[PDB]
Amino acid sequence: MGHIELASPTAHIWFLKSLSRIGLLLDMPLRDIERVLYFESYVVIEGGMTNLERQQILTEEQYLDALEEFGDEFDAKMGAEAIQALLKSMDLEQECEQL
């Protein structure tokens, strides 16, 4: 078997459309996941300030205010790689001991 090296990470469809397995893990609405996937809504990976919050839905116009306010302090980007970074950053042992 061979492999295909992709430039931008892409999301599997089985653990995304079937029920969610990517939404239940992230505790995120399914529709918002699609909105972020289609490069329409940003997500806050990390909020250095208290104004923002992890896993926040963001529109482009509402995101310009964040750019003009803070910029480097927060971490919010676009695309499936944002979801990948969210999975990288999250910790499940803390959820085990907390929930």
Binding site: R31, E34, R35, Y38, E40, T59, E60, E61
Partner: protein, 292 residues
């Protein structure tokens, strides 16, 4: 305010899975310019282009880089290699002829030497020495080269500034992080001498007990100095001028990229109109992407 209606459309979409209409909705914000936008954008691109030309103007070795390769083929009794296309090719506001390539080079050799001794007179910042350097740049300015060899000329500056930036970072990598070197005085002391150890032992003159026991790491903090001064000697250019070179070339290239961006989206409707006559061999969107 074309994005305000998007706040009402996207917030109330039916979550459509057709990418084509998402694509149109995303490029529908731009408008169609005419008779002023094209001219203004072209001017904003050409000023960036001549800013890049000024960026290659202040490098002392770029003018020698124009000539040493032609000297390789000048002594070959013939230059049949394609590098002869990357000649000066002066602008006039065609096969390269010896009556042009050598004639343009007749003054180049003279400017190669007349700007050397004058610089040593009354320091580097001498008035007539600097205007002679600017004239040596100007005889370089009257050229129109090809982007092939030119594509490496910009990287000849880019890699050099990347190297100096990495060397600057290396100081923080070695001592500032571990020893907590307050940057409040470091930035001022580095721009003072940056050639010898006046500020390095001035930091010993102050109390700074963290830097007092630097003898254990003396031979790894001053190797960055050795490399920086080696760069200064081999390049023949001071650190004062190279920062100005990189400061104003970056803004020029960013402005050119921004001008290209502000125009490309304005003409996507031509692409989307022309693509649809060609479907159906491949697809409905790959044609649009290739047209882009």
């Amino acid at each position: 305010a074309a994005a305000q209606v998007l706040s009402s459309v996207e917030s109330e979409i039916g979550r459509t899975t057709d990418p084509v209409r998402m694509y149109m909705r995303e490029m529908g914000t731009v408008e169609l310019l005419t008779r002023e936008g094209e001219i203004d954008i072209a001017k904003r691109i050409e000023d960036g282009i001549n800013q890049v030309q000024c960026s290659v103007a202040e490098y002392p070795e770029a003018i020698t880089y124009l000539l040493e390769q032609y000297d390789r083929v000048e002594a070959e009794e013939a230059r049949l290699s394609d590098l002869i296309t990357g000649f000066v090719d002066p602008n006039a506001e065609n096969s390269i002829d010896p009556e042009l390539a050598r004639e343009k080079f007749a003054e180049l050799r003279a400017q190669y030497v007349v700007t050397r001794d004058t610089i040593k007179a009354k320091g580097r910042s001498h008035a007539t020495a600097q205007e002679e350097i600017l004239k040596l740049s100007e005889v370089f300015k009257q050229f129109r080269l090809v982007p092939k060899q030119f594509d490496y000329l910009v990287n000849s500056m880019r890699v050099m500034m990347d190297r100096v930036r990495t060397q600057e970072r290396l100081i923080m990598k070695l001592c500032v992080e571990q020893c907590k070197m307050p940057k409040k005085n470091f930035i001022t002391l580095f721009t003072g001498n940056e050639t010898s150890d006046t500020w390095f032992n001035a930091a010993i003159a102050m109390n700074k007990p963290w830097s007092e026991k630097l003898h254990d790491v003396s031979e790894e903090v001053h190797r960055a100095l050795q490399k920086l001064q080696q760069i200064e000697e081999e390049t023949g250019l001071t650190i004062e001028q190279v920062k100005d070179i990189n400061r104003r070339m970056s803004i020029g290239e960013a402005k050119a990229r921004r001008a290209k961006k502000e125009m490309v989206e304005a003409n996507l409707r031509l692409v989307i109109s022309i693509a649809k006559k060609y479907t159906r061999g491949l697809q409905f969107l790959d044609l649009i992407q290739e047209g882009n």
